[PDB]
Write a protein that binds this ligand. Structure first.
Ligand SMILES: CO[C@H]1CC2=CC(=O)O[C@@H]([C@H](C)[C@@H](OC)C[C@H](OC)/C=C/[C@H](C)[C@@H](O)C[C@@H](OC)/C=C/[C@H](C)[C@@H]([C@@H](C)[C@@H](OC)[C@@H](C)CCC(=O)[C@H](C)[C@@H](C/C=C/N(C)C=O)OC)OC(=O)/C=C\C=C(/C)C1)[C@H]2O
Ligand SMILES: Nc1ncnc2c1ncn2[C@@H]1O[C@H](COP(=O)(O)OP(=O)(O)OP(=O)(O)O)[C@@H](O)[C@H]1O
Ligand SMILES: [Ca+2]
Length: 360
């Protein structure tokens, strides 16, 4: 019997079968109501005649009716499976409230009647996917960024840092700065286009000032992009100004430390004895870490903050868009994990609070 893995994200659901290389189903975490309801790709394409709901907000489920619709769509329409036949591994954000883990458990067992389930922390799975049980994860998605230090397989909750800046903020900022250049990116269709520009042409500069000076004095950094209707626009310093916001959040008026500083702060919250293990095992996870140049830049920035004798390694796997999912796939497949599933029987006897005893 094959386990399902469903990685529930603020922007995207990644779902598939444990053992697969990658999630079979990747679709927007959106529910539309005027059929009675629409989810994902279809909700997006039909958004004109629907009210859209975004039930996951900076990694936390906030609307359980809509989330039930997402999970229904995932099982029946995207994966074409009967939930009753499949143990299901779900993911959650670091520091997810206890009440949310219970609700997730109750819905899986009482609504979808799964035979077994488990809830795992997204950052922890990404670390596993990298081949490690010790390290510090920077997980940056569409809605939230976290730093999660993890030691011998378990997150250190008191050292976790949450930053409410992620990909959707970068897309919006790119819309703003392109509009400042003389283009017009304002509509919801235009947000989709700009997200595509972002994903194809943005990168992190090693030295922001130097890159701005190159863009000011030359066209060497410029790239062209054909809009749907064939109009060609040119992007120059916007390519690296957009992700620079990760390192300098005040560009969008956020009074927060950037991702190098949160990483450093998270390490410094940990026991001195393991700090060197964390510095040597910085793993990047999530779509918003996909920028070319980001690991080199992180290496530079962390080096400047850390002691001069410190060994620093930033690991940025090519598959890091899906490393949370991959981690869940390989966990659910593990022989030593089969005892860790919550069974339907255990739920039927103990109730939703079983999740606190068994998950983790
Ligand atoms: C087995 O298939 C792998 C991929 C792969 C595919 C392929 O086609 O080709 C094959 C290829 C031919 C290989 O064949 C086997 C050869 C390749 O040669 C270089 C080998 C690759 C390795 C897989 C390395 O990439 C990494 C490996 O190296 C030393 C690392 C292994 C570690 C030990 C594991 C663990 C991190 C991982 O085990 C599967 C996790 C899930 C362990 C989790 C635990 O032990 C936790 C602590 C406990 C308790 C739970 C705690 N929780 C939930 C806390 O929150 O779980 C029971 O980490 C892993 O296992 C990490 C990644 C595995 C992946 C992506 C799967 C191969 O490379
Ligand atoms: N190639 C890329 N370059 C830059 N950004 C990218 C790239 N690919 C995807 N992204 C961005 O990554 C985000 C989706 O990432 P991911 O699936 O990890 O987030 P999520 O799980 O939905 O959200 P969160 O983890 O914040 O809850 C989107 O903002 C998307 O535009
Ligand atoms: Ca995520």
């Amino acid at each position: 019997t094959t386990a399902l893995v469903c990685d529930n994200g603020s922007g995207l659901v990644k779902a598939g079968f444990a053992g697969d290389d990658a999630p079979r189903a990747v679709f927007p975490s959106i529910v539309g109501r005027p059929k009675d309801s629409y989810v994902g790709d279809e909700a997006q394409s039909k958004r004109g005649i629907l009210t859209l709901k975004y039930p996951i907000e900076h990694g936390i489920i906030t609307n359980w009716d809509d989330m039930e619709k997402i999970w229904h769509h995932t099982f029946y329409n995207e994966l074409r499976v009967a939930p009753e036949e499949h143990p299901t591994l779900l993911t959650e954000a670091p520091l997810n409230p206890k009440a949310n883990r219970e609700k997730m458990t109750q819905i899986m067992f009482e609504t979808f009647n799964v035979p077994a389930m488990y809830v795992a922390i997204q950052a922890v799975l990404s670390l596993y996917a990298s081949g490690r049980t010790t390290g510090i994860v920077l997980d940056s998605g569409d809605g939230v960024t976290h730093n999660v230090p993890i030691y011998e397989g378990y997150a250190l909750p008191h050292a976790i840092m949450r930053l409410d800046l992620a990909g959707r903020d970068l897309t919006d900022y790119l819309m703003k700065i392109l509009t400042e250049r003389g283009y017009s990116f304002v509509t919801t269709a235009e947000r989709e286009i700009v997200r595509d520009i972002k994903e194809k042409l943005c990168y992190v500069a090693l030295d922001f000032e130097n890159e701005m000076a190159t863009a000011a004095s030359s066209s060497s950094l410029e790239k062209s992009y054909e809009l749907p209707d064939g109009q060609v626009i040119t992007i120059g310093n916007e390519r690296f100004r957009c992700p620079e916001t990760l390192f300098q959040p005040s560009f969008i008026g956020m009074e927060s430390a950037g991702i190098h500083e949160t990483t450093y702060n998270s390490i410094m919250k940990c026991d001195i004895d393991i700090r060197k293990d964390l510095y040597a095992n910085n793993v990047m996870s999530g779509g918003t870490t996909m920028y070319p140049g980001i690991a080199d830049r992180m290496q530079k920035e962390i080096t400047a903050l850390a002691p001069s004798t410190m060994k620093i390694k930033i690991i940025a796997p090519p598959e890091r868009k899906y490393s949370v999912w991959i981690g869940g796939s390989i966990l659910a497949s593990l022989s030593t994990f089969q005892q860790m599933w919550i069974t339907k029987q255990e739920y039927d006897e103990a109730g939703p609070s079983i999740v606190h005893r068994k998950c983790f």
